[PDB]
Structure 1
Amino acid sequence: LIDNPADILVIAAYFLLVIGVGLWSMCWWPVGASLFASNIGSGHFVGLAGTGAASGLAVAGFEWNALFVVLLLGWLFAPVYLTAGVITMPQYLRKRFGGRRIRLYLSVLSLFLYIFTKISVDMFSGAVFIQQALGWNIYASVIALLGITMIYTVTGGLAALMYTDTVQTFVILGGACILMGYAFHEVGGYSGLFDKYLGAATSLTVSEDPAVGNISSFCYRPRPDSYHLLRHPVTGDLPWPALLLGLTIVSGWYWCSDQVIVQRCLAGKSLTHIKAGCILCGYLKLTPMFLMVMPGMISRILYPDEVACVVPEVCRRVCGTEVGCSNIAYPRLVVKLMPNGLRGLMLAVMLAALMSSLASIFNSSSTLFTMDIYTRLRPRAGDRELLLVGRLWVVFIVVVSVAWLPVVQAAQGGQLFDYIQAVSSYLAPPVSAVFVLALFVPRVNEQGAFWGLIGGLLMGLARLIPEFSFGSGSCVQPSACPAFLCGVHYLYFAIVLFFCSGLLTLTVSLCTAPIPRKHLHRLVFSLRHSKEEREDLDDPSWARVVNLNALLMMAVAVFLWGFYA
């Protein structure tokens, strides 16, 4: 419903200005802004809003545990990425363990998680945004998104992303604030939302498929525990013992092992400015509740027939998939509530962010592949061969991601955030456990760490592969997946995978002798400060102010946690 002069003109103007900015290059605030830019992504918007609409308020605990994991990065992991002289987590692991097997496995795992949790997610979120605006098919939407991403990459926007990212982080937050205000005004305010959400449900809940038959209230009714982050520890959408503990693992893997954030963080003048950037990122990481989760609840309130679709046929007609329209909440909000003038600007900035992220991820994946896999499979290299290989790899990941859109659409009952977190938790906890063990216990050996990593990979695939093979579905058509394999919340499986990988790493490393201290100097957290050389393997008041600010941030975070408990 954007086919009015007020919308197309603004979108075209916005894209033209972005291209011109890209073309021009052809001729505490920053650190925190860059850190939060990952959560500002439109994929994050869609996932969080859809999960909020589907379940309630609990999905914000993910973001606030990410606050507490950022106050773990800044004070525990950044100081070691500065005492080891290393930059990225795989570089720390290579320096500490040596060899090349660990680095090659990490490169392959990073490429897989880029294709699954980032590339496919961004493509699907852009497709959902375009479908909810132009009413297009998912494949046409992703084709258009890919085309505009190509224009972005060739006009040189990835060479001027400085002036299209850290100032787009203010247009996608002003638009988010304005849309939050509009949604709250439409729903009657804070109290209006909290009175109305529990009573918002679909009216078309019968279905004509004999097997489905009548649909139970449990599925089209909002969860009774929809206003509490502390869901039941066993029968809960987000088992709180996992939302806290079993997420700190995955979120630590992200903010301590995701090259984007690790390097954006290490791009600070001092450790007392990296801490301040982390503090500001945390305060800005408390905002996603009010900006995306509760607006998703308002989306469910205003558009139950669409967002709260429960009938398979209605859900196929609305979502495009029969599982559920959870992940169209924010797109529906944007395309319906906001005015005809600013709606186009909001959609343009969202799509520009999605395609900028896609371009950055394509470039990063090409660089990683060329410099870590083909560089070893053919040491001869050659610039022409490397460029051809990079372009062919971009084509390959684009094709595979396009072939993954149905799975992203139907994953975890149609909840994009649940899909992202499941794919993460099924592959991250192993590397997180290996990294933590390497940081803390010096007994870890290189071959032991590699064997632990690969064992965690195998035992996490033993749950990722069958889950996608059998599907997830919803109450209406529950998947025919084994109970013992599928019932356990993916975060509980995250904890189990973390601990199993740790136990395997200890078992393997205890078989052989440890690496001497000459290769551990200034690498272990317990031996950071030694004032001795190594053989390699190939303030007074500002600090107090930063500490007090961190304490204030934690106090605010715990206040909000208790308020929404």
Structure 2
Amino acid sequence: ETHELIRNAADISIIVIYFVVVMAVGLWAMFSTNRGTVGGFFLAGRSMVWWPIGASLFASNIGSGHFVGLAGTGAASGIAIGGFEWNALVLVVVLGWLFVPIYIKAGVVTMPEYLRKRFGGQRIQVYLSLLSLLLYIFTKISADIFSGAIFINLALGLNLYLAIFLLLAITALYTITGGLAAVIYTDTLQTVIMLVGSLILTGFAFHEVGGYDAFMEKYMKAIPTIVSDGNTTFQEKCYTPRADSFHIFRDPLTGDLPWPGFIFGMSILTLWYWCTDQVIVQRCLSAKNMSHVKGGCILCGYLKLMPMFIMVMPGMISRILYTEKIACVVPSECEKYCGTKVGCTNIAYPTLVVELMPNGLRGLMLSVMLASLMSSLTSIFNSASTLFTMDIYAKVRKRASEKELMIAGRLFILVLIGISIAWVPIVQSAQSGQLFDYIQSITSYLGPPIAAVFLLAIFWKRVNEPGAFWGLILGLLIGISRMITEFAYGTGSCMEPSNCPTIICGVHYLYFAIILFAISFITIVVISLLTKPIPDVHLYRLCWSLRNSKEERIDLDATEEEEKAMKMKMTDTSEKPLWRTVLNVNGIILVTVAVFCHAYFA
């Protein structure tokens, strides 16, 4: 059986040693955080070094969802997905240089808090907090848990219930009461283990496929023997490899992930994921200085070039070695091998792991997959706790002390942990052969409005609370309309094409993301220009025009000397000359490397 190879010996030893090390680092960092005050728990004390910030930025994004989805979908259509990671680096640079300086200069623990400070209404913050939490609980928790299930059932023998329970407990021991200091200090280990074990796997896979050139040639002839049987044969497009496989920039309409939608829509919802989304920014706001965030974000981008060569390429190698398993089309064979009737394309990475590498390497590598999942789940849980405590619980009790907010955050971590075990039945039982398509569709409907509202709350001065609210509501209504109309009719199978009309279903979800971005942008601008503006007195240091200004600010949400100095330092965003120069230069180098890679493959 495929789930007994890891049973031998060194597999268990390596996984248990990994667990011991991660738990130990979590506990040590738990006693190095000054927990008990919000400044030290949710923001880690604003004392994090540069490189742990970068490590956490990588490991919070990269989860089991990435490994499973990238490898499997790479077995479907080539390098198409890799560019997600690559767009990440450009936008992380953008984040580090533009968005974090304002948020630090605004003293905003949460992004909805920044929006309240700039706009001056409770409903904006409440709506954004609730929507962001729903996006968390659905998209990211689903990605992590589903991919956990896939690589667990294929590689291990553990039932989803026990496995997800144990992973949640291991996480909970340090995330529930660890805050960002514990998160990042345990996350740096996740990142290091991931990079090491995954470099070993990619090297082994490329050696066994015979190198990159032979990899290219062999991949294009990985056509499954069986294309017949059952009710009917299949149209020579559900199994054959794609001719545009090795190009990132594919046809604008004919191909999956067309280049216009690719670059534009991907940037649009990546501004949500990195610059506006709560999970990633907390990592940047927990810094010791303003140069440490730039160091972290450059490192994150530099080793965000790696993902493709470690997830997309192995998936292809998984297809080439085991084409019959990772390229089945016949419903009988597909239902036979792993599970879902249509699919079996999602098991490319875990089959490559459980088969390619030797015993000890298989153990360490399976623990890499676990390392992926734990980091993302820790990140989302802590960020959801921060959002809840800072907006919803804060507005349900205006006289709450710090201890009450801390206990509220911890209880929210507990409840949101329980939501994941409540989620495992849906993810297991539902027909999830197209799960990642749905996850990206969900993120492509509710993201662009929030990206627009924040890009206008920063790079603009006239927007106001009516405009932001009603643009967000309109964008939500459009996204929900399309989402319901696409889920009710359901996304089309290869043998049985789509049911639903071409206006809704014909448009690729990235194209609809950009369209919704444009509509929300226009609506926010129009409604804002109809209502009286917010004077500049209330917007010092909250818009890109006024960040340098040092006049007194009338907040829209409205020792002593030592406390004032500490506050000013926490809002201080100035670095030394030489360090600033080095950080600008290395950021430019990172973006250059990305442009070179984009041009090299695409």
- TM, length-normalised to structure 2: 0.86
Alignment of 1:2-21 (within 5 A): 2-21=6-25
Alignment of 1:454-493 (within 5 A): 454-493=473-512
Q: In structure 2, what is the equivalent of residue 399 of structure 1?
A: 422
Task: Tell me whether 185-194 or 386-395 shows the greater mean CA deviation.
Answer: 386-395
User: Among 549, 558, 562, which residue is 2:586 paired with?
Assistant: 549
Q: In structure 2, what is the equivalent of residue 54 of structure 1?
A: 76
CA–CA distance in structure 2, aligned partners of residues 69 and 463 of structure 1: 27
Q: In structure 2, what is the equivalent of residue 86 of structure 1?
A: 108
Q: In structure 2, what is the equivalent of residue 236 of structure 1?
A: 255
Q: Is the CA contact 1:22–1:158 (under 8 Å) kept in the aligned structure 2?
A: no
Q: In structure 2, what is the equivalent of residue 439 of structure 1?
A: 458
- Aligned-pair distance for 1:103? 0.9
- Aligned-pair distance for 1:66? 1.3
CA–CA distance in structure 2, aligned partners of residues 258 and 107 of structure 1: 11
- Residues 243-299 of structure 1, C-alpha deviation per residue, up to 9 Å, x if partnerless? 111111111111112223212123334433322322222211111121111111111
Q: Is the CA contact 1:408–1:419 (under 8 Å) kept in the aligned structure 2?
A: no
Alignment of 1:327-346 (within 5 A): 327-346=346-365
CA–CA distance in structure 2, aligned partners of residues 32 and 25 of structure 1: 17
CA–CA distance in structure 2, aligned partners of residues 389 and 58 of structure 1: 38
CA–CA distance in structure 2, aligned partners of residues 446 and 370 of structure 1: 22
Equivalent residue letter for 2:94: L
SS at 2:380 equivalent: helix
Equivalent residue letter for 1:77: F
Equivalent residue letter for 1:494: A
| Residue 536 of structure 2 corresponds to residue 517 of structure 1 | yes
Q: 1:386 to 1:223 in 2, by over 3 A?
A: closer
Q: In structure 1, what is the equivalent of residue 340 of structure 2?
A: 321
SS at 2:433 equivalent: helix
Q: 1:472 to 1:423 in 2, by over 3 A?
A: same
Please tell me the root mean square deviation across aligned C-alpha atoms, in Å: 2.6
Equivalent residue letter for 2:251: H
Q: Which runs of 5 or more residues in structure 2 are unaligned?
A: 32-49, 558-575
User: Among 496, 506, 528, which residue is 2:547 paired with?
Assistant: 528
| Residue 99 of structure 2 corresponds to residue 70 of structure 1 | no
Percent of pairs with identical residues: 59
Equivalent residue letter for 2:165: L
Q: Is the CA contact 2:22–2:189 (under 8 Å) kept in the aligned structure 1?
A: no
CA–CA distance in structure 2, aligned partners of residues 195 and 429 of structure 1: 39
Q: 1:363 to 1:67 in 2, by over 3 A?
A: closer
Alignment of 1:405-424 (within 5 A): 405-406=428-429, 409-411=432-434, 416=436, 418-424=437-443
CA–CA distance in structure 2, aligned partners of residues 342 and 142 of structure 1: 26
CA–CA distance in structure 1, aligned partners of residues 511 and 468 of structure 2: 23
Q: In structure 2, what is the equivalent of residue 559 of structure 1?
A: 596
CA–CA distance in structure 1, aligned partners of residues 98 and 248 of structure 2: 27
SS at 1:247 equivalent: helix
- Residues 503-531 of structure 1, C-alpha deviation per residue, up to 9 Å, x if partnerless? 11122212211111111122111222223
User: Among 140, 154, 163, which residue is 1:132 paired with?
Assistant: 154
Q: Is the CA contact 1:120–1:408 (under 8 Å) kept in the aligned structure 2?
A: no
Task: Tell me whether 379-388 or 433-442 shows the greater mean CA deviation.
Answer: 379-388
Q: Is the CA contact 2:385–2:409 (under 8 Å) kept in the aligned structure 1?
A: no
Q: 1:394 to 1:289 in 2, by over 3 A?
A: closer
- Aligned-pair distance for 1:226? 0.3
Q: 1:13 to 1:473 in 2, by over 3 A?
A: farther
Task: Tell me whether 357-366 or 83-92 shows the greater mean CA deviation.
Answer: 357-366
- Aligned-pair distance for 1:407? 5.0
Q: Which runs of 5 or more residues in structure 1 are unaligned?
A: none
Alignment of 1:219-298 (within 5 A): 219-298=238-317
Alignment of 1:32-51 (within 5 A): 32-51=54-73
CA–CA distance in structure 1, aligned partners of residues 321 and 538 of structure 2: 61
User: Among 133, 141, 144, which residue is 1:111 paired with?
Assistant: 133
CA–CA distance in structure 2, aligned partners of residues 438 and 408 of structure 1: 40
CA–CA distance in structure 1, aligned partners of residues 293 and 496 of structure 2: 48
Equivalent residue letter for 1:41: G
Equivalent residue letter for 1:247: M
CA–CA distance in structure 2, aligned partners of residues 420 and 541 of structure 1: 43
SS at 2:60 equivalent: coil
Q: In structure 1, what is the equivalent of residue 202 of structure 2?
A: 180
- Residues 54-86 of structure 1, C-alpha deviation per residue, up to 9 Å, x if partnerless? 110121211111111112112221222233333
How many residue pairs get matched?
555
Q: 1:155 to 1:541 in 2, by over 3 A?
A: closer
Q: In structure 2, what is the equivalent of residue 355 of structure 1?
A: 374
Q: 1:277 to 1:358 in 2, by over 3 A?
A: closer
Q: In structure 1, what is the equivalent of residue 160 of structure 2?
A: 141
CA–CA distance in structure 2, aligned partners of residues 386 and 23 of structure 1: 19
Task: Tell me whether 256-265 or 345-354 shows the greater mean CA deviation.
Answer: 345-354
Q: Is the CA contact 2:55–2:184 (under 8 Å) kept in the aligned structure 1?
A: no
CA–CA distance in structure 2, aligned partners of residues 22 and 274 of structure 1: 22
- Aligned-pair distance for 1:374? 5.4
Q: Is the CA contact 1:18–1:157 (under 8 Å) kept in the aligned structure 2?
A: no
Q: Is the CA contact 1:41–1:353 (under 8 Å) kept in the aligned structure 2?
A: yes
Q: In structure 1, what is the equivalent of residue 563 of structure 2?
A: none
CA–CA distance in structure 2, aligned partners of residues 32 and 376 of structure 1: 33
CA–CA distance in structure 2, aligned partners of residues 541 and 163 of structure 1: 28
